[PDB]
Amino acid sequence: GSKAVTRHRRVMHFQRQKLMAVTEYIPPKPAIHPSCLP
Amino acid sequence: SSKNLGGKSSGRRQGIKKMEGHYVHAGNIIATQRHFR
Amino acid sequence: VLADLAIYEPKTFKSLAALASRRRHEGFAAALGDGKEPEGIFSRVVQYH
């Protein structure tokens, strides 16, 4: 197996891939879009 | 090709034999060490 | 027994499909109204104790 530090982005364990998929940044959604409001 | 040679000495098993609170009869060894700890 | 009613008793299956569709419509109107008033009719589960 490869080292902890590599050159080639090192494909993750699928549990860790699910964890990084479920904890992404979700930006705040305005109710009415601000330009569509005066 | 392996210029270094010699460091194959095993561990001495030194350390604390009786921690705090252990009942100890007279003559039991409490701690083995080198270089006073 | 649902498949056996589907093959051998198609009137009873039409009755069951009408029941499921009416409870679906009641659930949709409850979703639009949050209740208020009646929580439907073919809702209101029977309570056992």
């Binding site: - | - | 029977v46 309570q47 056992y48 104790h49």
Partner: protein
């Protein structure tokens, strides 16, 4: 290296938003747990297998009642990711001697002390 996880103690300190979200009351806390085993001990370390065997959760989806004291809370904190803890609440009192045969668990954790099989 992979080792046992010690958890910081700021995790298990309920906020008033948590008190509004779930139902609990910080004064008068509940006395008993209802622990149910919802994840396999396989592909988990041996200490988690041992704690699951100690608590009495070998058969999955089978509820078990324990105390709410800090010692069993330490044992439940070790394997909190394999279980579902919900408070045993009692609508009537705790069961007397006359009741014991006629009782039931009733998910939503209500140990109902009278269990007929008739509609209301």
């Amino acid at each position: 290296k992979f080792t046992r996880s010690r958890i910081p103690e700021k995790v298990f300190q309920a906020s008033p938003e948590d008190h509004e979200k779930y139902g609990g009351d910080p004064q008068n806390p509940h006395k008993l747990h209802i622990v149910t085993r919802i994840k396999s001990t396989r592909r988990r370390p041996y200490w988690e297998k041992d704690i699951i065997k100690m608590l009495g959760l070998e058969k999955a989806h089978t509820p078990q009642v324990h105390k709410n004291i800090p010692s069993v809370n330490a044992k439940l904190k070790v394997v909190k990711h394999l279980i579902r803890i919900k408070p045993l609440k009692l609508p009537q009192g705790l069961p007397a001697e006359e009741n014991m045969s006629n009782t039931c668990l009733k998910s939503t954790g209500e140990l109902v002390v009278q269990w007929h099989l008739k509609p209301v």
